[PDB]
């Protein structure tokens, strides 16, 4: 049994609900808080803005030493770092940016990193500014992902639109 409430369960490990990722993570404080994040950690918008914001922009500031040390992250790869105030840890996992040019393949890589750890709380990748088709997000997220995922998507109109449509 864990914390997560009122979740729709789509799959044995997958589950989806309409909510605010920052406003879940401050009411259950997962072990795992997934961020929406880029290469540099720069957390200026989207998830990887409002989760920051929510930090006091310590994410920012622990994000920036971490590029300091180890250089930029790959796309499809991650790291992990402090949850501050929302989790545990905070897994910042770089799915590609449509908006860039990137290889919508590595959507799966990305997604991959998930499988590392045995609960989450996270975002659709690469969906929201980052440009890809939430549908196909969800689509890849159940069929990579083996671990349990409780997603978080910010928006009503398009979380009915994933349920509905959902295969
Ligand atoms: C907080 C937040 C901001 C932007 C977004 O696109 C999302 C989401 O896609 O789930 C969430």
Same mark, same amino acid.
């Given at each position: 049994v864990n914390s997560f409430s009122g979740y729709l369960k789509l799959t044995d490990n997958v589950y989806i609900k309409n909510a605010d990722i920052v406003e879940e993570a401050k009411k259950v404080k997962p072990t795992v808080v997934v961020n929406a994040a880029n290469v540099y950690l720069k957390? $200026? $918008? $989207?998830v990887a803005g409002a989760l920051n914001k929510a930090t006091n922009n310590a994410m920012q500031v622990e994000s920036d030493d971490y590029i300091a040390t180890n250089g930029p992250l790959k796309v499809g790869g991650s790291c992990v770092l402090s949850g501050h105030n929302?989790?545990?840890?905070?897994?910042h996992v770089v799915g590609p940016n449509v908006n860039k040019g990137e290889?919508?393949?590595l959507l799966k890589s990305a997604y991959?990193?998930?499988?590392?750890?045995e609960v989450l709380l996270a975002p659709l990748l690469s969906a929201g500014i980052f440009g890809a088709d939430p549908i196909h997000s969800l689509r890849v997220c159940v069929d990579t992902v083996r671990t349990n995922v409780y997603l978080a998507v910010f928006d009503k109109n398009l979380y009915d639109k994933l349920v509905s449509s959902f295969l």
């Open positions: 957390h $200026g $918008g $989207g929302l989790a545990k840890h905070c897994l290889d919508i393949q991959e990193n998930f499988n590392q750890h």
